[PDB]
Symmetry: D2
Amino acid sequence: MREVVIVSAVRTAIGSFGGTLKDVSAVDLGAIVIKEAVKRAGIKPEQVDEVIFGNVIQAGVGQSLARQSAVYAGLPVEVPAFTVNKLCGSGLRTVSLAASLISNGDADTIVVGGSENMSASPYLIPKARFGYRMGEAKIYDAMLHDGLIDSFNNYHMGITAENIAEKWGITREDQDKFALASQQKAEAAIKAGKFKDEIVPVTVVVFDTDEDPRFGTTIETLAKLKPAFKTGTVTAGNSSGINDSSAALILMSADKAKELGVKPMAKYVDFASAGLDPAIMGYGPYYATKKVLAKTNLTIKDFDLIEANEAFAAQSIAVARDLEFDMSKVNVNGGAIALGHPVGCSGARILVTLLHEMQKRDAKKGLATLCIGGGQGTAVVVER
Amino acid sequence: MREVVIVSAVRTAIGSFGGTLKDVSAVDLGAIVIKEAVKRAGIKPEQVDEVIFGNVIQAGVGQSLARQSAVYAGLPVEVPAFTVNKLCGSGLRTVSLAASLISNGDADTIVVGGSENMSASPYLIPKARFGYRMGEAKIYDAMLHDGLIDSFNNYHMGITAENIAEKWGITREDQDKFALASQQKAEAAIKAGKFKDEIVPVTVVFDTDEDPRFGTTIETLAKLKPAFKRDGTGTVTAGNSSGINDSSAALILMSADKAKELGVKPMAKYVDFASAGLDPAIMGYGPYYATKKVLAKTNLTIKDFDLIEANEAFAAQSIAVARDLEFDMSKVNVNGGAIALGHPVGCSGARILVTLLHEMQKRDAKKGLATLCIGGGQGTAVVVER
Amino acid sequence: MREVVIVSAVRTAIGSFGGTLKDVSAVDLGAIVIKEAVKRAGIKPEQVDEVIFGNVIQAGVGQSLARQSAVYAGLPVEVPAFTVNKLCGSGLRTVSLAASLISNGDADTIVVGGSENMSASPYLIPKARFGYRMGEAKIYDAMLHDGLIDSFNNYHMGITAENIAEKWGITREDQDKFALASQQKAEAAIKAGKFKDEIVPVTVVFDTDEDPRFGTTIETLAKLKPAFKRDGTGTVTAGNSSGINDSSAALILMSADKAKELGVKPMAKYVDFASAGLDPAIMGYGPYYATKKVLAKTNLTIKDFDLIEANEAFAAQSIAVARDLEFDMSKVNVNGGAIALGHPVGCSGARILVTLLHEMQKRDAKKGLATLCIGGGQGTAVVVER
Amino acid sequence: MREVVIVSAVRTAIGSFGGTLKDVSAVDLGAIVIKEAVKRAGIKPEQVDEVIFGNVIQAGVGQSLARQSAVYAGLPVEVPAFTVNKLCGSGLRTVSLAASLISNGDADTIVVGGSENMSASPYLIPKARFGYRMGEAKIYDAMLHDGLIDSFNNYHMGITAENIAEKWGITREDQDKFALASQQKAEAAIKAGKFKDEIVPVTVVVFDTDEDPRFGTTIETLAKLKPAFKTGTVTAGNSSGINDSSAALILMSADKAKELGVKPMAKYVDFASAGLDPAIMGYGPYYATKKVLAKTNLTIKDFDLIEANEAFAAQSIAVARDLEFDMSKVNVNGGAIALGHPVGCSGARILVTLLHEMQKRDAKKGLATLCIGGGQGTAVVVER
């Protein structure tokens, strides 16, 4: 093995569904963050060995996004690239993969991250090729069909949250209280400038501020909302949204960062992925996190900051209780309920957020983890 | 770093465009080969640590194919999985990635491969969400738009074959002759039983590659019309291109340590890989750069390979590559290649490796190369050794 | 008021669903029959004063079919035209309308008829304009949505046939026996050359009705499964319903005065018409009301007709009608009906009239009735006389 | 022959494209005006003998609109109905047809008119049935494909106006001056309440006022606009719009109006239709009007009011010059440039407008005429 470091990390502000980044392609969002990450690391484009990038709703983006974003970022055509799809886990799995390839000597410098434009995703017509012959037929929303709908059970991932709420005893009030605190933390962090260092502006009008948060959210406001997916408890107010954004990081061997005089943001320690019953996919962080702790001989007390993606309050609460998070150190600047869940990006997005806040607080150790549609979880530990 | 071995390798026969596997989903084809791969390895399902699988035209297959296929194959829900898209390279990149992960200690046993159902791929309506407002618009073929059309130049990958025929001076006749040999070798290989070991039956009982055109003659090929250009300048035809096809393939890589512990007799040792980028406009030449690079990593030359699988996307790109890497053509695609057999994009990279390993065993061959060009301007390669 | 005569009558043979005319547009089929109708009348094109033509599934045919067909048929651009949509009734309503116009002095010579290409009809995307925003949606078959599904009940017109089989107590066996006779008579009529005079060839050389199922037996019909209900309650099948079909038909009506002036020998005199509405849920019974009404206008009874064409949309509705109007069945659909020949919706009403006039001439018959049921809950009828 | 009278006439306000009537089906608009026309004539529903109704973009309205609108209007199911498609001429051709049927003794009472919702029209996928096999394909806008595009020449009807502008020497300035006067007349008529008697409200918010007119239009505003269809001169400012609306009238034999004590609004005199070269379809009113004058032994001087549909300024100007209209008596309350052109309705719409203004002015004779896509024109003369 060899030591791996993270040398730069950047993200766009997160667009709302049908919002300010609705007409900026996933490809273009990826290009902006790849270019900017290279700039921030102070290396040459030619120094990148590979690009590994998340993208989940691939329908209609054209050939393999990673390759497109790399070239339009201005990396040489000589740089090879591939696209990862681990659903919600995509952006964060690019990180661990890269660290493994560098550790094993297969590369020195890899650009990682993820891009998703859920707004711009198309509809699908399954039998346009050989025809329907007779009778009405269904067109599908690619973002749901290839993303947010569990393919095994053919229900929304919202139902997986209700399953967890039921099975873990998580009340509507608890869910809404969790949501409120995400909105509160997010509004305070935005106005306090916490995200200024990590965000690259996009000109569409200069878009530089996360727009999904609902400032002034109250417990009463949340309480009014109707369950969105079914007896229900999971609403659009206590669930992440549908969003458009990208994020990029650069991993390097400690060897090559030294040679080039590149100052690392943090050390990559390790990762873990786990599968579990699709019907409770939201609990996957439990298994992932446990595994990475057994690999690293660590404990939850050893983390100064935790980014745990907030797909749904119900799943986040279940995770937090069973890993026994200290919630003072979780998602300190807000989480996905407020900020958004651009599926193929989020995993990298939360790592970008973690790293910059780790710097501001001079934290030692850090955990990023999130649930994955179809029944998975993945986690990464960093240290400074 | 640790040694990595290949313990099993299996594929479906390759369906034609709108042919016998047109209604078996990419997901189901993947399950079949993942299932059989595990069975052939003599391993329990719970032994698998991860599934890394290729799938290029992902429109309408549902959530990430790798996880769906792994679960429908009977692998425990505890096994994590993800889907790789390096276009035509996908299936072979799953192999090199898994090797790096096992070598780095991040796993002991990984299922890899790829599945593509090009026939079942949908059309797309880009502005159905917020509306077209007024006037005509276009719906797109997912297989072309997300696969076989170069997204930088917005022309078909067949034009890249044309760009290469122009710059390397590869005539229509040279292309047709390469295509005839590919058809001849596939016919003899099929009739000689060469594919019987590696193919797993699919009851729709489909067990024979159906895209080959038995009795192909040079005159046959000369009658066909340029498929991508017309206007006089064309040389690439349906007869000297790979087809559009539906198939899956799977392999199991394992640390040498874990193999020995379990008493699994490996098929072969994984040696190394390389990937390279180049000008998208001549993407077909990617094997050259990828092969030169893996050769340098392994300290081998082309003479060292008993058997070579170089994927036949287009005769025009395969000829440029063979010339510039100075292949001994008697050792290349000995059982026929994609012109004859087909090019199920996300599967092919794994497919050619299963074909290579089986021929290597038949021949007691010592060293093997699998390489292929990649839409967008890339190439990847893997060396194996027995 | 003035006398109106029919001077020419012609149809294409009837194409099957996805059959030989599937790629000849409704517009082109209309041009063919309008062309030949004029030629058969021995009239110059410039003699035509108006074209009134039927077309039901208008989605994607372009601007108003009547005008397109009239111009492509070589009629002067000066000839005005419009398209009638009374669903299944359309082609026959063009006839009665033109008669009223000529009788009222608003024209001397009118081309009438209908054209339907059901095979070539498109699908619809209702919210493509302003967008679906989120989630699954439906695309609709134009032929069902704008034709064969009752828009008030949103069930298929086949259910209306089921409603009638229930209320009139018409068994599956009665339906199958009516269907067998229709298949028998069409086979004999075709082989006897009965359709040779009225049919105009279309080179795609299509000149023979292709929907009939020669050698139909009662056992054949009994094997088929209910097409519209299932759940046990079904009796209406593909074998005892009309099909989905593609064809055109045209006729030329003229004042008796203008006919004599020009020396045009008429085929027949137009007598009168009636149209009626009823409960959409039993739309198939519309002929009863329409026929009772035209009988009252003309002071005739059913016994007075030598020949009857009652369109066979569904055996179930045709049996109810025949019973309640007390038809002499030996005089009905003597050359077979729509179960055998097909139901190209916007054409059929004209089609059955061309078939009637030709048989009337063969038989030197004196009086004739053409009637058919209409989706939405209507019926229309026309009496003619030689 | 027998005398025919018009006993009632009514229309909805005309919706803008994507405007207030975008989600009120053509069927429903037809039902509102049929019901209201019956009410205004003071007859029973059972007294209607037949419904003949215009509808041009039929794609996706379901089975034959005339029949649907009749039943949902509350006319007995016993009433027979059929739908006419003479493109732009549809609504007015229903009138003449009906008068012929009544004159000939085939009916006593016919409801006529037209309904078009252009907004709600769908897109078309030609080969969904037997499939596209491979490669991109086109979806079509039904309103253009089955309506506003000349099927012979495969160009917009806008090009037919440019053809006329070129061939008749009609300048951009002349076109824009014509447009301005339509807007001016329309704004004045609306604010003056001229349309209050003829409009039936629709609750969607009570919609009762034509919304397409652009109040405050200036010659300078028009002059700024860019040609819309090609050297060009025809803009969206000097062309009718795309619109949603319905209109209904009731024709009766003089015999039956007498029997029932129904007070007629006017006498139907006669009509004419004409075909001409599709490429100059806008000039069809010339031929139509000439023919109806030869039938009625009348002259343009004999009309106290003229409604000449304003498809395009260029065609309207050409028509007006060659028939030598006195433009003081044409479209006195504004025309389609301001008000809109709901294709299947317009022909009936202009007759509704004509009749009510004929009443207000106590005019004796009246002409309604309009051009028809695909190369036609149609005209009707009424008298009080």
